[PDB]
Design a protein around this motif. Structure first.
Motif, short mmCIF file in Angstrom:
data_model
loop_
_atom_site.label_atom_id
_atom_site.label_comp_id
_atom_site.label_asym_id
_atom_site.label_seq_id
_atom_site.Cartn_x
_atom_site.Cartn_y
_atom_site.Cartn_z
N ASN A 18 28.99 16.37 39.48
CA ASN A 18 27.63 16.70 39.88
C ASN A 18 27.38 18.20 39.76
O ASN A 18 26.29 18.62 39.38
CB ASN A 18 27.38 16.24 41.32
CG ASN A 18 26.82 14.83 41.39
OD1 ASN A 18 26.82 14.10 40.40
ND2 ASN A 18 26.35 14.44 42.57
N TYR A 19 28.39 18.99 40.10
CA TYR A 19 28.28 20.44 40.03
C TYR A 19 27.93 20.90 38.61
O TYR A 19 26.94 21.59 38.39
CB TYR A 19 29.58 21.10 40.48
CG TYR A 19 29.86 22.42 39.80
CD1 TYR A 19 30.72 22.49 38.71
CD2 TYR A 19 29.28 23.59 40.25
CE1 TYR A 19 30.99 23.69 38.08
CE2 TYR A 19 29.53 24.80 39.63
CZ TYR A 19 30.39 24.84 38.54
OH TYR A 19 30.65 26.04 37.92
N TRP A 63 36.15 14.18 45.52
CA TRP A 63 36.07 15.49 44.89
C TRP A 63 35.64 15.38 43.44
O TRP A 63 34.87 16.20 42.94
CB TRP A 63 37.42 16.21 44.98
CG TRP A 63 37.46 17.49 44.21
CD1 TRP A 63 36.67 18.59 44.41
CD2 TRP A 63 38.33 17.81 43.11
NE1 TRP A 63 37.00 19.58 43.50
CE2 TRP A 63 38.01 19.12 42.70
CE3 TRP A 63 39.34 17.11 42.45
CZ2 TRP A 63 38.68 19.74 41.65
CZ3 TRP A 63 40.00 17.74 41.40
CH2 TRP A 63 39.66 19.04 41.01
N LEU A 75 32.04 15.51 43.09
CA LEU A 75 31.49 16.84 43.35
C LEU A 75 31.58 17.72 42.10
O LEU A 75 30.70 18.55 41.85
CB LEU A 75 32.23 17.51 44.50
CG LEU A 75 31.40 18.43 45.39
CD1 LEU A 75 30.83 19.58 44.58
CD2 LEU A 75 30.28 17.65 46.07
#
Length: 12
Positions: A10-11, A4, A7
């Motif tokens: 990267n988000y 997570w 994520l």
């Protein structure tokens, strides 16, 4: 977690 943290990094 399930990678997570990756994520979120990267988000943004």
């Amino acid at each position: 977690e399930k990678r997570w943290r990756r994520l979120i990094f990267n988000y943004f």
